[PDB]
Design an enzyme around this catalytic site. Structure first.
Site, PDB file in Angstrom:
ATOM      1  N   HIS A  14      38.248  10.157   1.585  1.00 39.72           N
ATOM      2  CA  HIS A  14      38.946  11.162   2.357  1.00 39.72           C
ATOM      3  C   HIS A  14      39.267  10.656   3.751  1.00 39.72           C
ATOM      4  O   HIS A  14      40.088  11.244   4.435  1.00 39.72           O
ATOM      5  CB  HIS A  14      38.020  12.335   2.535  1.00 39.72           C
ATOM      6  CG  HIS A  14      38.697  13.643   2.603  1.00 39.72           C
ATOM      7  ND1 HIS A  14      39.384  14.166   1.527  1.00 39.72           N
ATOM      8  CD2 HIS A  14      38.700  14.572   3.580  1.00 39.72           C
ATOM      9  CE1 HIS A  14      39.819  15.362   1.851  1.00 39.72           C
ATOM     10  NE2 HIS A  14      39.408  15.638   3.114  1.00 39.72           N
ATOM     11  N   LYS A  30      50.506  20.141 -11.058  1.00 35.76           N
ATOM     12  CA  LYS A  30      50.795  18.900 -11.754  1.00 35.76           C
ATOM     13  C   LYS A  30      49.590  18.482 -12.590  1.00 35.76           C
ATOM     14  O   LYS A  30      49.770  17.889 -13.649  1.00 35.76           O
ATOM     15  CB  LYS A  30      51.191  17.776 -10.800  1.00 35.76           C
ATOM     16  CG  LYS A  30      51.832  16.584 -11.492  1.00 35.76           C
ATOM     17  CD  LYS A  30      52.299  15.519 -10.521  1.00 35.76           C
ATOM     18  CE  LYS A  30      52.938  14.340 -11.228  1.00 35.76           C
ATOM     19  NZ  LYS A  30      53.728  13.503 -10.294  1.00 35.76           N
ATOM     20  N   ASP A  31      48.377  18.801 -12.116  1.00 37.76           N
ATOM     21  CA  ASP A  31      47.156  18.473 -12.840  1.00 37.76           C
ATOM     22  C   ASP A  31      47.047  19.321 -14.099  1.00 37.76           C
ATOM     23  O   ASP A  31      46.498  18.851 -15.092  1.00 37.76           O
ATOM     24  CB  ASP A  31      45.891  18.524 -11.977  1.00 37.76           C
ATOM     25  CG  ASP A  31      45.725  17.377 -10.975  1.00 37.76           C
ATOM     26  OD1 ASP A  31      46.254  16.269 -11.237  1.00 37.76           O
ATOM     27  OD2 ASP A  31      45.049  17.592  -9.926  1.00 37.76           O
ATOM     28  N   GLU A  85      29.190   1.396 -29.164  1.00 36.20           N
ATOM     29  CA  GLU A  85      30.331   2.294 -29.173  1.00 36.20           C
ATOM     30  C   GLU A  85      31.564   1.570 -28.660  1.00 36.20           C
ATOM     31  O   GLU A  85      31.458   0.611 -27.896  1.00 36.20           O
ATOM     32  CB  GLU A  85      30.015   3.479 -28.285  1.00 36.20           C
ATOM     33  CG  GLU A  85      29.094   4.426 -28.990  1.00 36.20           C
ATOM     34  CD  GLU A  85      29.781   5.620 -29.628  1.00 36.20           C
ATOM     35  OE1 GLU A  85      30.285   5.478 -30.770  1.00 36.20           O
ATOM     36  OE2 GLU A  85      29.806   6.694 -28.980  1.00 36.20           O
TER      37      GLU A  85
HETATM   38  C1  HEM Z   1      28.758  11.840 -18.491  1.00 36.22           C
HETATM   39  C2  HEM Z   1      28.182  12.833 -19.126  1.00 36.22           C
HETATM   40  C3  HEM Z   1      27.745  12.538 -20.507  1.00 36.22           C
HETATM   41  C4  HEM Z   1      28.123  11.537 -21.384  1.00 36.22           C
HETATM   42  C5  HEM Z   1      29.157  10.425 -21.161  1.00 36.22           C
HETATM   43  C6  HEM Z   1      27.313  11.787 -22.537  1.00 36.22           C
HETATM   44  C7  HEM Z   1      27.394  10.991 -23.658  1.00 36.22           C
HETATM   45  C8  HEM Z   1      26.740  11.296 -24.825  1.00 36.22           C
HETATM   46  C9  HEM Z   1      26.938  10.610 -26.028  1.00 36.22           C
HETATM   47  C10 HEM Z   1      27.864   9.451 -26.246  1.00 36.22           C
HETATM   48  C11 HEM Z   1      26.120  11.153 -26.955  1.00 36.22           C
HETATM   49  C12 HEM Z   1      26.103  10.654 -28.381  1.00 36.22           C
HETATM   50  C13 HEM Z   1      26.861  11.767 -29.090  1.00 36.22           C
HETATM   51  C14 HEM Z   1      26.815  11.726 -30.598  1.00 36.22           C
HETATM   52  O1  HEM Z   1      27.391  10.757 -31.173  1.00 36.22           O
HETATM   53  O2  HEM Z   1      26.279  12.644 -31.278  1.00 36.22           O
HETATM   54  C15 HEM Z   1      25.407  12.226 -26.326  1.00 36.22           C
HETATM   55  C16 HEM Z   1      24.451  12.988 -26.938  1.00 36.22           C
HETATM   56  C17 HEM Z   1      23.777  13.937 -26.229  1.00 36.22           C
HETATM   57  N1  HEM Z   1      23.955  14.314 -24.947  1.00 36.22           N
HETATM   58 FE1  HEM Z   1      25.154  13.596 -23.721  1.00 36.22          FE
HETATM   59  N2  HEM Z   1      26.518  12.840 -22.365  1.00 36.22           N
HETATM   60  C18 HEM Z   1      26.708  13.329 -21.178  1.00 36.22           C
HETATM   61  C19 HEM Z   1      26.124  14.379 -20.530  1.00 36.22           C
HETATM   62  C20 HEM Z   1      25.074  15.078 -21.072  1.00 36.22           C
HETATM   63  C21 HEM Z   1      24.347  16.076 -20.373  1.00 36.22           C
HETATM   64  C22 HEM Z   1      24.479  16.604 -18.957  1.00 36.22           C
HETATM   65  C23 HEM Z   1      23.420  16.548 -21.224  1.00 36.22           C
HETATM   66  C24 HEM Z   1      22.490  17.605 -20.757  1.00 36.22           C
HETATM   67  C25 HEM Z   1      21.381  17.539 -21.433  1.00 36.22           C
HETATM   68  C26 HEM Z   1      23.572  15.806 -22.458  1.00 36.22           C
HETATM   69  C27 HEM Z   1      22.854  16.028 -23.570  1.00 36.22           C
HETATM   70  C28 HEM Z   1      23.091  15.312 -24.726  1.00 36.22           C
HETATM   71  C29 HEM Z   1      22.305  15.619 -25.941  1.00 36.22           C
HETATM   72  C30 HEM Z   1      21.232  16.681 -26.089  1.00 36.22           C
HETATM   73  C31 HEM Z   1      22.745  14.762 -26.884  1.00 36.22           C
HETATM   74  C32 HEM Z   1      22.186  14.638 -28.261  1.00 36.22           C
HETATM   75  C33 HEM Z   1      22.822  15.555 -29.248  1.00 36.22           C
HETATM   76  C34 HEM Z   1      24.034  14.822 -29.797  1.00 36.22           C
HETATM   77  O3  HEM Z   1      24.079  13.642 -30.246  1.00 36.22           O
HETATM   78  O4  HEM Z   1      25.071  15.489 -29.821  1.00 36.22           O
HETATM   79  N3  HEM Z   1      24.597  14.948 -22.308  1.00 36.22           N
HETATM   80  N4  HEM Z   1      25.804  12.268 -25.010  1.00 36.22           N
HETATM   81  C1  LIG Z   2      36.284  18.094  -4.875  1.00 33.27           C
HETATM   82  C2  LIG Z   2      35.203  19.144  -5.126  1.00 33.27           C
HETATM   83  C3  LIG Z   2      35.326  20.392  -4.225  1.00 33.27           C
HETATM   84  C4  LIG Z   2      34.211  20.604  -3.185  1.00 33.27           C
HETATM   85  C5  LIG Z   2      34.437  19.755  -1.923  1.00 33.27           C
HETATM   86  C6  LIG Z   2      33.435  18.623  -1.788  1.00 33.27           C
HETATM   87  C7  LIG Z   2      32.148  19.144  -1.148  1.00 33.27           C
HETATM   88  C8  LIG Z   2      31.635  18.152  -0.111  1.00 33.27           C
HETATM   89  C9  LIG Z   2      32.679  18.060   0.990  1.00 33.27           C
HETATM   90  C10 LIG Z   2      32.056  17.940   2.367  1.00 33.27           C
HETATM   91  C11 LIG Z   2      31.892  16.489   2.773  1.00 33.27           C
HETATM   92  C12 LIG Z   2      32.438  16.320   4.184  1.00 33.27           C
HETATM   93  O1  LIG Z   2      33.858  16.452   4.127  1.00 33.27           O
HETATM   94  C13 LIG Z   2      34.472  16.534   5.403  1.00 33.27           C
HETATM   95  O2  LIG Z   2      34.550  17.911   5.802  1.00 33.27           O
HETATM   96  C14 LIG Z   2      35.390  18.193   6.934  1.00 33.27           C
HETATM   97  C15 LIG Z   2      35.542  19.701   7.012  1.00 33.27           C
HETATM   98  O3  LIG Z   2      35.339  20.313   5.728  1.00 33.27           O
HETATM   99  C16 LIG Z   2      36.777  17.501   6.850  1.00 33.27           C
HETATM  100  O4  LIG Z   2      37.416  17.571   8.124  1.00 33.27           O
HETATM  101  C17 LIG Z   2      38.846  17.699   8.078  1.00 33.27           C
HETATM  102  O5  LIG Z   2      39.256  19.059   7.977  1.00 33.27           O
HETATM  103  C18 LIG Z   2      39.032  19.958   9.081  1.00 33.27           C
HETATM  104  C19 LIG Z   2      39.932  21.179   8.811  1.00 33.27           C
HETATM  105  O6  LIG Z   2      40.231  21.347   7.410  1.00 33.27           O
HETATM  106  C20 LIG Z   2      39.189  19.340  10.503  1.00 33.27           C
HETATM  107  O7  LIG Z   2      38.229  19.912  11.417  1.00 33.27           O
HETATM  108  C21 LIG Z   2      39.053  17.803  10.581  1.00 33.27           C
HETATM  109  O8  LIG Z   2      39.799  17.329  11.708  1.00 33.27           O
HETATM  110  C22 LIG Z   2      39.469  17.049   9.306  1.00 33.27           C
HETATM  111  O9  LIG Z   2      39.020  15.690   9.315  1.00 33.27           O
HETATM  112  C23 LIG Z   2      36.687  16.019   6.465  1.00 33.27           C
HETATM  113  O10 LIG Z   2      37.974  15.392   6.282  1.00 33.27           O
HETATM  114  C24 LIG Z   2      35.846  15.875   5.214  1.00 33.27           C
HETATM  115  O11 LIG Z   2      35.624  14.484   5.003  1.00 33.27           O
END
Ligand code: HEM
Ligand SMILES: CCCCCCCCCCCCO[C@@H]1O[C@H](CO)[C@@H](O[C@H]2O[C@H](CO)[C@@H](O)[C@H](O)[C@H]2O)[C@H](O)[C@H]1O
Ligand SMILES: CCCCCCCCCCCCCCCCCC(=O)OC[C@H](COP(=O)([O-])OCC(O)COP(=O)([O-])OC[C@@H](COC(=O)CCCCCCCCCCCCCCCCC)OC(=O)CCCCCCCCCCCCCCCCC)OC(=O)CCCCCCCCCCCCCCCCC
Ligand SMILES: CCCCCCCCCCCCCCCCCC(=O)OC[C@H](COP(=O)([O-])OCC[N+](C)(C)C)OC(=O)CCCCCCCCCCCCCCCCC
Ligand SMILES: CCCCCCCCCCCCCCCCCC(=O)OC[C@H](COP(=O)([O-])OCC[N+](C)(C)C)OC(=O)CCCCCCCCCCCCCCCCC
Ligand SMILES: CCCCCCCCCCCCCCCCCCCC(=O)O[C@H](COC(=O)CCCCCCCCCCCCCC)COP(=O)(O)OCCN
Ligand SMILES: CCCCCCCCCCCCCCCCCCCC(=O)O[C@H](COC(=O)CCCCCCCCCCCCCC)COP(=O)(O)OCCN
Ligand code: HEC
Ligand code: HEM
Ligand SMILES: CCCCCCCCCCCCO[C@@H]1O[C@H](CO)[C@@H](O[C@H]2O[C@H](CO)[C@@H](O)[C@H](O)[C@H]2O)[C@H](O)[C@H]1O
Lengths: 71, 383, 54, 244, 124, 85, 56
Positions: free
Chosen positions: B202, B228-229, B272
């Site tokens: 930022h 756009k997102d 994988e």
């Molecule tokens: C970046 C976030 C995550 C990625 C990339 C990720 C990736 C994976 C992958 C690749 C598997 C294997 C899936 C399968 O083939 O069955 C899996 C399983 C699992 N993940 Fe995650 N995971 C993520 C976040 C989480 C989070 C936050 C939890 C919270 C507990 C979680 C819980 C599990 C559980 C319980 C399984 C086992 C059940 C299953 O295989 O479906 N994961 N995850």
């Molecule tokens: C993307 C997920 C959404 C949640 C946002 C992320 C949470 C954590 C953000 C806080 C981290 C500090 O972030 C910082 O905050 C201040 C004020 O908010 C910003 O400050 C900016 O905006 C304010 C007004 O909008 C001005 O006073 C300043 O001149 C300018 O630089 C910084 O540019 C930013 O770097």
């Protein structure tokens, strides 16, 4: 009676005739080679698996759809 | 003064998602950042939900995943969503890294967001590796075995460290339970680093596809990039839908539907798909330790892009030679991916080594050479 | 058609109420419509089609 | 690797369930259960399927309770703490032919017949592999193949030597719906049944996917209109420069 | 890399007859394919500016040059977001692609590099 | 390196007049057909080589390698395989 | 014209309507995972015979 039996035979004699011949020739060679003595004490024993796969792969391509149509 | 600016908490949100000044010419490749945030949110929601039904004990783990598929209402969806989104997370992360490399997002003044990003990428790999183990199918177990055995290469202490990771003398219950705990944790650590790299960014603001300053022409993040997102969110959800609902196992390995069996070794132990290029790089080096170092170096070398790119111009939009080199680099990275899943046989052995040499020589030789030459061509070419 | 704007769109309270009521109607009708469509393209295949034998 | 070591890859047969909008043919599922019950269940378990899972898929509640009630399952101990049996309930899982792995291997010349609940997901090819394997025992192994003792030649199985003998022959089952029980018919039915066993959500999943595709498509179309609408001030912007 | 480095190297090439004979035509083709002129940029518009040195050089531009630079950047940004190319007078012709910034950055860097040298001087 | 609204850090701007119209006053899809055909063709043509060259080369490489590998593990390729190991 | 504004709000409103219908579907289906699973609902309605039980 099993619809597959007839479809496979038809596909072997027809569109997969070239592959049928290869498999046949192969079997002839291998059986003759097994008949010969000191075959057991050879390094390389030829099989016919490759030719069989080519034939089966061909038969399946010409049959799969026809077979499931009559079930 | 408007509340969204006055109140300190709202103002932090405002500064990131609403008044944030963005270049007015970001193209669709700037949308991967938000898709990655969407993947991260989907993974948290589905993951936490799976955690409510999954049992980490090795005696029950595989069966708990079957229970989720079969008994839990919409369990099939939550499981497939989590598993497929892990694949999409890597497609989007590679796209995001690709965008950053092509457009020189790693150059000053954005070295810090880039470098934190390289750590996010490592955490994603660890997260996804541990999550894969939790199923405790054949690929889960054998993948954990071979990947954790790489640590045995570390001299002197290697064997001791592996036993320490496993909590035992082989991959088994202790390993599974600890990977559950860490797999739960790691996505939160990943979210923190993702937030850090944004905060780092930022200060400079987003780069743009021309590689010039955008200070001259800014647009509020909302509504323009908000809407756009949405387009890519819905495009992503369409791709998500086709996998999750219609082909949920296309990206999967069948062997993971066989319960882990330490006796039977599966035909081919491959990671994988998204880890395959690193696996190819490892196989390329004959030495065990060499292979491990190369594999890690293949990721950490991204940290030197800020140094080895000698261009006076940011990004590749206007650099024909750099664009060709980048094209070859990307296609080579995909070839490495493919060679990661072939059998260790001729002629792929030699080919894997050549691709690995090309991978490293891009950072170490070609990019420094090409960027130096193009500098000269721009100067002489415009005289 | 000014009338339609004035009633349903001008006030955001009314617009959001309209959107949610429309979502309710859509959700119920789309459910019913897909159910019928699904049963026609998968005719004689589903349990409901063979259940009568038992 | 050699093609032999991989196994011949099975043909793509046109299953009723192939096709984005297609369910299983439930009549085929029911027939396939009867093949499982009369042929495969001698050696193979189906441990992840409960009697209740058949209800409203292949059988009515009454038929399935009848199947459950014919078997004896372990009850809670009686009041003297002695073991007891009870008749099966719909909540019970379909019981296996062997008490453990060792008993299974002893009955099959050392080979262990896998549980079939997931086998359609657990092999490349799925239904097609199961169909190809059951129907793909040649009369004679290709000349030159040496089978290990107690192995049977089947090209679809990797390595070629499979511990399971050919088991489907014309008329081993008498279907209750009058369908001719040919080898191919029985293989198709049982392969369909096993595919259902591996993925029982299949029918519902594809219907919800249809709804999702439609809604998400419309939202994607509208999001494009809305993006273009909101962006038009920026796209349409015009400049006049007069150097100062 | 420093603009100084780029400029010195280029001058070594333009000196050598052989080198210039083979490099000048290549560089001209490179610049044609680069296609920055199709967005109405001059070469110098593309140089990375988020460096203390380059910020200083930009502050040293004559007001006229500075205002025109801002216009070219804004105009190019608009072409980029529209996915259009410049047409007619907006296309930079080779004769208009002047190195307006190079003298300023070379002066800034000359002083910065002299400063580095003199910070390392050793009385003999 | 970047400020915020009102002090973004632009060099001073003077003499650029910017004009635009309301989203409600514009046709959002004006000239879409022309753009979808001619503009997309132009942009694709200009980038085609940078995609086709590396893709075609690496696909050819893979094709050659996969065909050789397949051939080495046939009967016919026994001798060449023995040498390759 | 009011027709002109109304049309663009019809597009925005349709998008809001499908987003609402989609969110409701997503929330409802997703949260249902937390309602009693199939195995729990089975180990629930206990059936007992009465022929076995003597008088008194
Ligand atoms: C970046 C976030 C995550 C990625 C990339 C990720 C990736 C994976 C992958 C690749 C598997 C294997 C899936 C399968 O083939 O069955 C899996 C399983 C699992 N993940 Fe995650 N995971 C993520 C976040 C989480 C989070 C936050 C939890 C919270 C507990 C979680 C819980 C599990 C559980 C319980 C399984 C086992 C059940 C299953 O295989 O479906 N994961 N995850
Ligand atoms: C993307 C997920 C959404 C949640 C946002 C992320 C949470 C954590 C953000 C806080 C981290 C500090 O972030 C910082 O905050 C201040 C004020 O908010 C910003 O400050 C900016 O905006 C304010 C007004 O909008 C001005 O006073 C300043 O001149 C300018 O630089 C910084 O540019 C930013 O770097
Ligand atoms: C995954 C999850 C799903 C979500 C989808 C997100 C993907 C969107 C994205 O980033 O890519 C779309 C993206 C459209 O983005 P854009 O903002 O219109 O232009 C981005 C380019 O910089 C603009 O590039 P350009 O203006 O030079 O146009 C180039 C493009 C033409 O771009 C078109 O869209 C046409 O054509 C090609 O490069 C095709 C190569 C030739 C093959 C034959 O498509 C490409 O341009 C892909 C080219 C990659 C090679
Ligand atoms: C496959 C090979 C791709 C090579 C790309 C070459 C450039 C090109 O034609 O792309 C179109 C466009 C060209 O866009 P551009 O911004 O250069 O040009 C726009 C138009 N002009 C020049 C007039 C301003 O490039 C991109 O948008 C590139 C994004 C790269 C994403 C890569 C993902 C790969 C993952 C690897 C991770 C490690
Ligand atoms: C996902 C949640 C979807 C909720 C939909 C409920 C109605 C809100 C909506 O679609 O946006 C209309 C409204 C306003 O859209 P608007 O900003 O176009 O409407 C304002 C102008 N009038 C009132 C004249 C039409 O959005 C919101 O209030 C924010 C909710 C976002 C969803
Ligand atoms: C999936 C979820 C998408 C469904 C919600 C989209 C909005 C629904 C329609 C409502 C709408 O268009 O009105 C705007 C609300 O949009 C908004 O306020 C949000 C705009 C876009 C919605 C989400 C933004 C995505 C950007 C980043 C994606 C992050 C992914 C990571 C999880 C307000 O219109 P207006 O505010 O323009 O003013 C106009 C005057 N009131
Ligand atoms: C978590 C993962 C997010 C991915 C969403 C994709 C679909 C998931 C929902 C399940 C589904 O298939 O819904 C169908 C309808 O599709 C739809 O209408 C859903 C598609 C809409 C996608 C985007 C909308 C919101 C997504 C996330 C927003 C989060 C906010 C609140 C949860 C079936 O319909 P049904 O009959 O099952 O429906 C019950 C009411 N009849
Ligand atoms: C009396 C024994 C027996 C009968 C009857 C039997 N099987 Fe098997 N089956 C086995 C054995 C043993 C194996 C293990 C073979 C091996 O690993 O070599 C096996 C393996 C399989 C495999 C997996 C092969 C693989 O890829 O690992 C499937 C699928 C299979 N059987 C399905 C069936 C179906 C369907 C039926 C009947 C409709 C059936 N079986 C009947 C003994 C039997
Ligand atoms: C969870 C993973 C990640 C998330 C959620 C994430 C999110 C984002 C977001 C929202 C942006 C700003 C918008 C955009 O340019 O797309 C961004 C920019 C950036 N990200 Fe990431 N990112 C992630 C991973 C990474 C990784 C792995 C890298 C690098 C290896 C990286 C490097 C960057 C850089 C350098 C930028 C600035 C690019 C620019 O605008 O020019 N990020 N990221
Ligand atoms: C932020 C949250 C706000 C509070 C909201 C609380 C929501 C919790 C809602 C759970 C309700 C689920 O209750 C149940 O939903 C399912 C779908 O999930 C519906 O189920 C219906 O559609 C599904 C597919 O979607 C089919 O599998 C099923 O055969 C059919 O009956 C049920 O008819 C309804 O009884």
């Amino acid at each position: 009676p099993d619809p597959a039996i007839a479809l496979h035979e038809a596909a072997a004699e027809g569109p997969c005739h070239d592959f049928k011949h290869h498999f046949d020739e192969c079997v002839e060679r291998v059986t003759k080679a097994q008949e010969a003595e000191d075959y057991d004490h050879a390094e390389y024993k030829e099989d016919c698996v490759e030719e069989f796969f080519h034939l089966q792969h061909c038969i399946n391509d010409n049959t799969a759809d026809k077979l499931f149509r009559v079930l | 003064m408007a509340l969204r600016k006055k109140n300190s908490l709202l103002n932090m949100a405002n500064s990131y998602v609403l008044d944030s000044p963005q270049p007015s010419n970001l193209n669709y490749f700037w949308n991967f950042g938000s898709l990655l945030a969407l993947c991260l949110v989907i993974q948290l929601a589905t993951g936490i939900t799976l955690a409510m039904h999954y049992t980490s004990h090795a005696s029950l783990a595989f069966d708990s995943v079957e229970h989720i598929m079969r008994d839990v209402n919409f369990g099939w969806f939550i499981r497939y969503a989590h598993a497929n989104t892990a694949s999409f997370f890597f497609i989007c992360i590679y796209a995001h890294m690709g965008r950053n490399i092509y457009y020189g997002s790693y150059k000053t003044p954005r070295v810090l967001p880039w470098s934190i990003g390289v750590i996010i990428f490592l955490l994603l790999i660890i997260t996804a590796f541990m999550g894969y183990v939790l199923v405790f199918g054949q690929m889960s177990l054998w993948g954990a075995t071979v990947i954790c055995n790489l640590v045995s290469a570390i001299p002197w202490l290697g064997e001791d460290i592996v036993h320490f990771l496993w909590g035992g003398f082989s991959v088994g219950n202790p390993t599974l339970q600890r990977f559950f705990a860490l797999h739960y944790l790691m996505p939160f650590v990943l979210a923190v680093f993702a937030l850090l790299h944004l905060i780092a960014l930022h200060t400079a603001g987003s780069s743009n596809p021309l590689g010039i300053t955008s200070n001259v022409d800014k647009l509020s993040m909302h509504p323009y990039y908000s809407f756009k997102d949405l387009i890519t969110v819905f495009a992503f959800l369409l791709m998500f839908t086709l996998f999750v609902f219609f082909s949920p196992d296309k990206l999967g390995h069948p062997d993971n539907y066989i319960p882990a069996n330490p006796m039977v070794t599966p035909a081919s132990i491959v990671p994988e798909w998204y880890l395959l290029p690193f696996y190819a790089i490892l196989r390329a080096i004959p030495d065990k330790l060499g292979g491990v170092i190369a594999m890690v170096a293949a990721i950490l070398i991204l940290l030197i892009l800020p140094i080895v790119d000698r261009s006076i111009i940011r990004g590749n939009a206007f650099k024909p030679i750099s664009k060709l080199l980048f094209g070859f680099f990307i296609c080579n990275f995909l070839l490495l991916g493919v060679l990661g899943q072939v059998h260790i046989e001729p002629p792929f052995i030699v080919l894997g080594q050549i691709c690995t040499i090309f991978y490293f020589s891009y950072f170490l030789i070609l990019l420094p050479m090409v960027s130096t030459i193009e500098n000269i061509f721009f100067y002489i070419g415009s005289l | 058609a000014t009338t339609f704007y004035n009633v349903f769109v001008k006030r955001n309270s009314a617009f959001v109420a309209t959107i949610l009521a429309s979502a309710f109607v859509f959700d119920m009708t789309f459910e019913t419509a897909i159910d019928n469509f699904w049963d026609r393209i998968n005719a004689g295949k589903q349990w409901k089609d063979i259940r009568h034998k038992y | 690797m050699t093609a032999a070591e991989h196994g011949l890859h099975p043909a793509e047969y046109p299953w009723p369930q192939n096709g984005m909008l297609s369910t299983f043919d439930h009549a085929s599922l029911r027939r396939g259960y009867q093949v499982y019950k009369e042929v495969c269940a001698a050696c193979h378990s189906l441990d992840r399927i409960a009697w209740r899972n058949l209800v409203g898929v292949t059988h009515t509640t009454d038929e399935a309770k009848a199947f459950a009630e014919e078997l004896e399952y372990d009850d809670e101990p009686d009041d003297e703490g002695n073991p007891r049996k009870r008749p099966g309930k719909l909540a019970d899982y379909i019981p296996g032919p062997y008490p453990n792995e060792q008993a299974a291997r002893a009955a099959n010349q050392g080979a262990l017949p896998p549980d079939l609940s997931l086998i359609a997901k657990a092999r490349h090819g799925g239904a097609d592999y199961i169909f190809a394997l059951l129907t793909g025992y040649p009369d004679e192994p290709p000349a030159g193949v040496v089978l290990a003792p107690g192995m049977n030649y089947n090209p679809y199985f990797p390595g070629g030597g499979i511990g399971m003998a050919r088991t489907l022959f014309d008329g081993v089952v008498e279907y209750e719906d009058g369908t001719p029980a040919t080898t191919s018919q029985m293989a198709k039915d049982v392969a369909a049944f096993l595919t259902w066993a591996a993925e029982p959500e299949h029918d519902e999943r594809k219907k919800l996917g249809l709804k999702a595709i439609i809604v998400i498509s419309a939202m994607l179309g509208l999001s494009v209109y809305i993006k273009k609408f909101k962006w038009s001030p920026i796209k349409n912007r015009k400049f006049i420069y007069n150097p100062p | 890399a420093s603009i100084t480095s780029v400029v010195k190297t280029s001058e070594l090439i333009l000196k050598s007859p052989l080198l210039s004979k083979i490099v000048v035509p290549l560089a001209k083709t490179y610049v044609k394919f680069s296609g920055y002129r199709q967005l109405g940029f001059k070469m110098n518009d593309l140089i990375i500016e988020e460096t203390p040195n380059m910020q200083l050089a930009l502050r040293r531009l004559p007001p006229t040059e500075s205002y025109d630079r801002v216009y070219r950047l804004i105009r190019a940004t608009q072409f980029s977001l529209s996915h259009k190319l410049a047409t007619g007078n907006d296309i930079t012709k080779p004769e208009e692609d002047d190195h307006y910034l190079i003298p300023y950055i070379l002066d800034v860097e000359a002083e910065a590099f002299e400063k580095d040298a003199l910070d390392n001087l050793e009385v003999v | 390196y970047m400020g915020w609204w009102g002090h973004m850090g632009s060099p001073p701007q003077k003499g650029i007049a910017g004009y635009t119209i309301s989203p409600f006053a514009a046709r959002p899809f004006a000239g879409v057909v022309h753009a979808a055909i001619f503009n997309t063709f132009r942009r694709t043509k200009n980038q085609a080589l940078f995609v086709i060259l590396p893709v075609s080369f690496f696909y050819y490489v893979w094709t050659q390698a996969s065909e050789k590998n397949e051939w080495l593990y046939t009967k016919a390729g026994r001798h060449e395989l023995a040498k390759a190991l | 014209t009011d027709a002109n504004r109304l049309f663009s709000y019809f597009m925005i409103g349709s998008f809001g309507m499908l987003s609402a219908a989609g969110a409701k579907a997503t929330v409802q289906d997703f949260l249902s995972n937390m309602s009693a699973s199939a195995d729990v609902l089975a180990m629930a309605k206990v059936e007992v015979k009465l022929g076995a039980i003597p008088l008194g």
